[PDB]
Design a protein around this ligand. Structure first.
Ligand SMILES: CCNC(=O)c1cc2c(N[C@H](c3ccc4c(c3)OCCO4)C(C)C)ncnc2[nH]1
Length: 168
């Protein structure tokens, strides 16, 4: 149903909210929820652990069967699988982990995957323990994504910093 509410409009197609992506998925019932994935789809930590626990591990069982046959994704790549109880589909997107020395330039490729979908609920890619500068990730999002993206950032201090910086 894509019933998004309470978002700050940053550009004609990018929106942001201080919210838990799991609670947004339950309220909004989106066509697509984006997971902040890693290449072998191990859904621990961060957004991935939160989404997988909210599916009672159904996402991890489906992801393990996908990886057994298809092997890992690449950094910057993505994979559509079921959204289970949270969405129609989950778009698993791998941003670079700069705290592990991955290439920050591939963050543009990671966001480009969003352009195959008319509307998405998503986290801020490569943030948290992946180490990218959040202000930089929001700029790459705004400059790359053309479809309608609703960003849920579950940290009030980070959200207030991003909004203040974007409005400069
Ligand atoms: C109570 C259950 N819910 C949650 O624990 C939860 C965590 C959430 C989150 N985390 C951000 C993040 C964004 C990209 C990430 C990442 C972490 O980890 C590493 C890979 O990339 C963080 C910067 C605030 N963003 C949005 N909704 C979230 N919900």
């Amino acid at each position: 149903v894509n019933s998004f509410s309470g978002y700050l409009k940053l550009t004609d197609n990018v929106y942001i909210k201080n919210a838990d992506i799991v609670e947004e998925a339950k309220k909004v019932k989106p066509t697509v929820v984006v997971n902040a994935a890693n290449v072998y789809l191990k859904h621990g930590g961060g957004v991935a652990g939160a989404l997988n626990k909210a599916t009672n591990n159904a996402m991890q069982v489906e992801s393990d069967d996908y990886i057994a046959t298809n092997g890992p994704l690449k950094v910057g790549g993505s994979c559509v699988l079921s959204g289970h109880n949270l969405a129609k589909h989950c778009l698993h997107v791998v941003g670079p982990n700069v705290n592990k020395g991955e290439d920050i330039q591939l963050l543009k490729s990671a966001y480009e995957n969003f352009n195959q979908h008319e509307v998405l609920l998503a986290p801020l890619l490569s943030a948290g323990i992946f180490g990218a500068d959040p202000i930089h990730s929001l700029r790459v999002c705004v400059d790359t994504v053309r479809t309608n993206v609703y960003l849920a950032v579950f940290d009030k201090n980070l959200y207030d910093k991003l909004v203040s910086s974007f409005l400069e």
